Every structure is written in C-alpha cells, then in structure tokens.
C-alpha cells in the first residue's frame, strides 16, 4: 500500500499524485472508472509495461479503487532536466556526455520497440536521483493516449521541432528524434535552448531553426569533437543528418562510455533490470464497472 505525499504536474501537460511505498517514491496517474476502460487503455498499459530500459520511466503496476483505475509509474525524483539546469547552471562537458549516452541508449531502445517521435515526446526529459539517470518516455506520452492532457495555446519548446517537421509532409520520425537529442545536448552544455533567445518570439526562433542558425557562446568551452557532433546533428536536410548508430560510433560519444551501454540487442536490456499480465488483465476487467 502507498501513502499520499503531493499532487505534482506530469510530463506532457498532465496530472499525477506523488505517493510512497520499500522506501520508494511512485507517481500515480488516474482514469475515471466509468467504462473509459476501452481497448485503447489496455494495449497502452501492456505496451508501456514491455518497456524495460533503465532510462525509460517504467510501469510499476495498476491498482483498482472505487473512484478510478490507478496507474502506478516509476517517479523521477530529480524532476525536469531544464528546470534543473536553470537552478544549477549548465553542466560540464563530462556531465553532459554522461547523460547524452544514456539518452541515446534510451532513444535507441525505444526506436527498436517501435516507439518514436510524437509517441516518445523527447521535449520531455526527466532526471532521477536513485544513478543519476535521465528518463524519457512517460505513460501519458503516446499520440493516441487515453490519459488526459492539457497543452498550452502556444507550443512550449519549439527548438525541439526538426526543420523537416515544418518543411515537408513525409519524413522519418526516428531521424527527427535525432534533432531533438541534439537539442537536449545543447541545453545541457549551454544552459539555454538553442535557436530561441528575447524569448517566446516564435518568428525569430522558427527563422533560426529553419536556417539552423545556432551559436555556442564564448563563456562555454567545449571540445572540438563535441562541437562536431552538434554540427553533425543540427542539419536541416534529414538525409545528411547523422544517424543514431553513427552517433554511437562517434569519438565524443565513445569516450568514457560504460560497458553496459554498449548493448546491441533489445532483449538483453530487458533481462538486465529484471505484476503479472493476469493481474493487470483481472484489474482492468473489474475497472469497467463504475
């Protein structure tokens, strides 16, 4: 059983109740029990349950209550990465590298599990105290999510939008995700989103994105290999943009790369970190009753 602690805000503009077990913190999302418990909600849970990468926010369990169906998720006790960088400064090239390796390991895994682009929402990066680990891909993140969402009238972090998302009508989603990773790397190193600055002037930000007009300021001193990786990622033409496997073989990435993050197959990740499907199915059944 768990004990109420707070009501924090979720990842993609959502709501959750922070609770506590073990001395472990958990994030619990809820969903109106009145037969909102379709087939969309079942597949989406079982899907997310199959995602076992340590840098993915992972499904813990599902509890039935008189009010709703409770979705217990793993909690990111470090919070949002950007809000971190703000009240702590830009990270060093070595701290940035640590986390970037984790991201790529995670993105790579998600891509392999068929999860990407708007299903993965890389604008949302979280941190957790329990390596440090950066954590992506929370429950209410898919395009077809049954989880309630309340996005703003204006888009939050447009820098994450790859130019081909604005420019073309057909493009690879996994490759658009590379650009996003670039954005996450830049913010870690500089302490500010790249193509943006007066902020919230979308005209200027979009202008800079489309012309890939960024500038690493002088107060930030980073190696030439790092600047190269960034220049290889921030290219408007998807076809000339560096790929994930290519990133995995780049010098900057390879330096101080731990052994476990040298994982090819997706099935050794699953065994690496190791509630039953019958339990989940039994509870979603009892959940259709208001």
């Amino acid at each position: 059983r768990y004990e109420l602690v707070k009501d924090i805000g979720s990842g993609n503009f959502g709501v959750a109740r922070l609770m506590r077990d073990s001395n472990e913190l958990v994030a619990v999302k809820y969903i109106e029990r009145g037969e909102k418990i379709d087939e969309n909600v079942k597949r989406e849970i079982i899907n997310h349950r199959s995602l076992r990468h340590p840098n993915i926010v992972r499904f813990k369990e599902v509890i039935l209550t008189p009010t709703h169906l409770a979705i217990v998720m793993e909690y990111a006790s470090g919070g949002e990465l950007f809000e971190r960088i703000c009240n702590a400064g830009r990270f060093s090239e070595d701290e940035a590298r640590f986390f970037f390796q984790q991201l790529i390991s995670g993105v790579s895994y998600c891509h392999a599990m068929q999860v990407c682009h708007r299903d993965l929402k890389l604008e949302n990066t979280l941190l957790d105290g329990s390596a440090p680990r950066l954590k992506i891909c929370d429950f209410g993140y898919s395009k077809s999510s049954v989880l309630h969402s309340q996005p703003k009238s204006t888009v939050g972090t447009p820098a994450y939008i790859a130019p081909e998302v604005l420019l073309k009508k057909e493009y690879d989603g996994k490759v658009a995700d590379v650009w996003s990773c670039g954005v996450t790397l830049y913010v870690m190193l500089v302490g500010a989103y790249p193509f943006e600055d007066e902020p919230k002037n979308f005209r200027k930000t979009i202008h800079r994105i489309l012309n890939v007009q960024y500038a690493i300021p002088d107060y930030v001193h980073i190696s030439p290999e790092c600047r190269h990786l960034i220049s290889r990622i921030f290219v408007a033409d998807p076809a000339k943009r560096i790929s994930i496997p290519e990133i995995r073989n780049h010098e900057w990435f390879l330096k101080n790369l731990p052994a476990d993050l040298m994982n090819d197959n997706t099935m050794t990740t699953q065994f690496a970190a190791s509630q039953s499907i019958e339990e989940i199915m039994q509870i979603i059944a009892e959940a259709t009753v208001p």
Binding site: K152, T154, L166
Partner: protein, 315 residues
C-alpha cells in the same frame, strides 16, 4: 410580448490566474450597454429598441495586451458598428446582419491592435497595441429579451442549457477541425501535429485576434450564431478553456443549474429593485462552484467563467 419589455440581466463571473505565472485571461460584462433596433431581432408589438447586455471572455496568449485590449475596447467597437449599420436604414436576413456587424467589429479591433486602424490615446493615432506574436481568443454574447447572439473566435466557447440538453452556441476553432484544416492547407499554410494540432507547429487555434505573424492563416473572422430565446432556456455559460479542458458541456450546465437552484431554495429570490444592478448571487454561486471544481479536476490554466441566468423566475 417578449418584444415589449426588456429583461433583467442576471449574471455572475469568475476570472482567476490559476496555476499560471501570469493572468492573460480577461473578461467584460456591460449590462444595459447598447440599444438594439428591433428590426435586427424581429423582422421586416412596438418597442423601437431592445436593451442588449454585453458579455465577453478573452483568453490571451503570448502576453496579456491583446486580451486586455479586447476587455477595454471590443464592446465599444461593437457599439460603433451597430451605429454604422443604421446606414441600412435605407437599403438580407438577421443572421447576415449580425454576422456582418460582428465581423467588422472583430476586424476593427484586430486592425487597431496591429496599428493599421486609428485608435484613442491619452489625437487619433496609429500605434500597435502589442507584439506580433501576442493574441487572444474572444467569445461574446449579446443577450436581450428576444435573442442571444454569440460571436466566437478561438477556443473559448459559449454553451446554452435548453431544458435538459446542453447545446453549444460556438464550435472551437481548432486547426484539426475539418473546415478549418481545409481553409489553412488550401490557403498555402501548414497544420502540424505537435502537442496537439497547431498552425505551423505553434498555435493551437485557427482563429483569434492579433497574431499578426500567423496571418492570413489565423484569421479574426468570427462565427456568429443567432439564437432566439425560449421558455425552456435555463442558463448561458461563457468560459475560457481553463474550464472546458476539464469538463464537458452537459455536466457544466447541470452543475450550474443545480447551484443556481440550490441558492434560490436556501435563500429565496431577492427583490426586483436589486436585480440587474450588479451580480446575481445565485449565478455567482454557480460560477464560483464550477471554478473550484475545475481547479480540483486538475486545470492549470487561467480560468474565466460567466454564468447567466435566463429564467424569468424560479419558485
């Protein structure tokens, strides 16, 4: 019979900052504000004009200047257009007339905001009101004895409760809405899917006031609806998305009706002398309640709600 006696405006309002860093919502309620030539409501029982009570919600984005400007100006702009359309006192149903007057009003304000139409300042200067990326929604309702007129632009909406079935009087201008999507794309603009359907990946609406930078894809042309009042009418609710994001039409109306009746049953209707000279406490009750309900349902946006009682008397 309805065209020979003005109605008493019964209303209550909430407009709060909620969990946001700024308040960019604004509203305006101007009862007894304008006199409506009867031919604009009736046709072709004398009373040459009906008193029209103005209600407005303006949900701003990118800043507060444009929502605030609507608050201070729009009703006056609307008044001017009503006067202009007494050059029709010479020369075309009611719908077309209202649609026409409301389009010119919303367009005038838009122009004043971008500094292409002359406006008053503390002699009639051309000065922009705000940056090119700041804008606002606008939903307004004219209530008189005979008719309700709603003119909507953006994702705030107005909902009428008629008997037992909720019926909205505006449809949200979201970029993935069929005609809207089409209009944009066919015009040469782009709607992307990113944290919802967005014009060019940025703005979660297809219509608004301001937002120069997304012209002429994001337009200030409103969608006016002309609704004759009925004896079954219970109430009218205008609100920003702060409310509609967490609650459906039907439940909002029902809750609002309950609380109105709840206050009347546990306090009885006040004397005619007080009525319409300020906020009706039963409406204020409903407004206040819906407001806190939204906050508990998890709404993190600015919240603005105007509840308007449409019932002659409740016994």
């Amino acid at each position: 019979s309805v065209y020979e006696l003005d109605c008493i405006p019964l209303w209550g309002t909430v407009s709060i900052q909620g969990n946001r860093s700024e308040m960019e919502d604004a509203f305006a309620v101007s009862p007894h504000f304008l006199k409506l030539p009867i031919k604009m409501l009736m046709g072709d029982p004398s009373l040459t004009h009906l008193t029209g009570h103005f209600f407005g919600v303006y949900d701003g984005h990118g800043g507060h200047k444009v929502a605030d400007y609507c608050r201070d100006r729009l009703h006056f702009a609307l008044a001017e257009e009503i006067e202009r359309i007494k050059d029709e006192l010479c020369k075309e149903g009611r719908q077309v007339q209202w649609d026409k007057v409301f389009t010119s009003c919303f367009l005038t304000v838009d122009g004043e905001i971008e500094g292409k139409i002359g406006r008053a300042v503390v002699d009639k200067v051309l000065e922009a009101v705000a940056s090119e990326t700041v804008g606002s929604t606008a939903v307004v309702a004219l209530v008189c004895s005979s008719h309700i007129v709603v003119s909507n632009c953006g994702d705030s909406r107005a909902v009428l409760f008629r008997g037992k079935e909720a019926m909205p009087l505006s449809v949200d201008h979201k970029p993935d809405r069929e005609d809207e999507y089409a209009r944009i794309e066919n015009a040469g603009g782009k709607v992307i899917q990113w944290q919802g359907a967005r014009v060019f990946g940025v703005l979660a609406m297809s219509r608004s006031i301001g937002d120069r930078y997304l012209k002429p894809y994001v337009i200030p042309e409103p969608e006016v609806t002309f609704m004759p009042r009925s004896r079954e009418d219970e109430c009218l609710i205008l609100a920003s998305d702060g409310l509609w994001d967490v609650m459906n039409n039907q439940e909002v109306c029902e809750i609002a009706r309950r609380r109105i009746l709840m206050w009347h049953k546990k306090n009885g209707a006040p004397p005619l002398a007080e009525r319409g000279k300020g906020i009706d406490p039963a409406c204020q009750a409903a407004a206040d309640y819906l407001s806190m309900l939204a906050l508990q349902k998890g709404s993190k946006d600015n919240i603005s709600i105007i509840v308007i009682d449409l019932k002659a008397q409740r016994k």
